[PDB]
Amino acid sequence: MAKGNRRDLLERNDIEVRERDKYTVHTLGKKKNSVAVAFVKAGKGDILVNNVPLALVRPEILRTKVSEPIMILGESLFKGLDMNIKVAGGGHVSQIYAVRQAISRGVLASVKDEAARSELRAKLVSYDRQLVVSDPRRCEAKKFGGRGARARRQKSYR
């Protein structure tokens, strides 16, 4: 239902103010019509999605996909960070991929050191480059000649 670019979602005004400030880092990730917003604060370590524990997100079979940014690296740094992700857009899979992208970008920023940041960048991008850089391709239009983007209505030459 949510567009993804609403001012409310982008600024995460849903959270109460006194807890809004404690989140410092801001991150973003998207795939196709899906926008995921992540706020980070250092802590004992934990993740959330749309007010849900990270484990119990229901593509089920894609749990490893939502958690790849973690098991790729060590849990050492993920231990000291806590996230409150909020996602909205089109399709379960798109939301999944956007979420993992946001996780990667957010963890990358919080390192606070540029050299180790570059080292993590090299490690992560070696694996699936589309964990940091976004995916560009997007749905295209349809022309009146046919009933699809490229397909045309069947023609009878006789």
Partner 1 sequence: SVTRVPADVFINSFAAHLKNRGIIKCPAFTDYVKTGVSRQYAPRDADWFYIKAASVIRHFYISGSHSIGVAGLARKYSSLQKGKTTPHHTKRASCKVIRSIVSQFLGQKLLIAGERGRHISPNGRKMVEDFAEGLQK
Partner RNA sequence: AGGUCUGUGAUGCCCUCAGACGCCCUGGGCCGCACGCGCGCUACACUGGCGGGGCCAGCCGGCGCCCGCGAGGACGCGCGGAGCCCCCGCCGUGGCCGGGACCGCGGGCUGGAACGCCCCCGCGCACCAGGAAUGUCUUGUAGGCGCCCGCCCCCACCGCG
Kindly state the smallest distance separating residue 52's Cβ from partner 1, in Å: 6
Give the dihedral of Cα atoms 23, 106, 51, 35; nearest 10 deg: 110
DSSP annotation of 11: H
43 interface partner picked from partner 1, RNA, none, CB below 5 to 8 A per type: none
Site string for partner 1, 25-54 (x = CB under 8 A): --------------------------xxx-
Question: Does an H or E element contain 36, and which?
Answer: strand 35-42
51 interface partner picked from partner 1, RNA, none, CB below 5 to 8 A per type: partner 1
16 or 114, CB closer to partner 1? 16
153 interface partner picked from partner 1, RNA, none, CB below 5 to 8 A per type: RNA
Q: Is 88 in the site for RNA (CB under 7 A)?
A: yes
Identify whether the C-beta of residue 63 lies closer than 8 Å to the C-beta of residue 35: no
For 6, the token pair is 């609403």
Kindly state the smallest distance separating residue 138's Cβ from RNA, in Å: 6
Kindly state the smallest distance separating residue 50's Cβ from partner 1, in Å: 9
The residues near 118 (Cβ < 8 Å, ≥ 6 apart) are none
Phi, psi of 28 (to 5 degrees): -150, 150
45 or 90, CB closer to RNA? 90
| Whole-angstrom distance, CA of residue 105 vs CA of residue 69 | 9
Site string for partner 1, 56-95 (x = CB under 8 A): x-x-------------------------------------
The residues near 99 (Cβ < 8 Å, ≥ 6 apart) are 29, 36, 49, 66, 85, 87
Interface residues with RNA (CB under 7 A)? 1-4, 32-33, 50, 58-61, 88-92, 95, 135, 137-145, 147-157
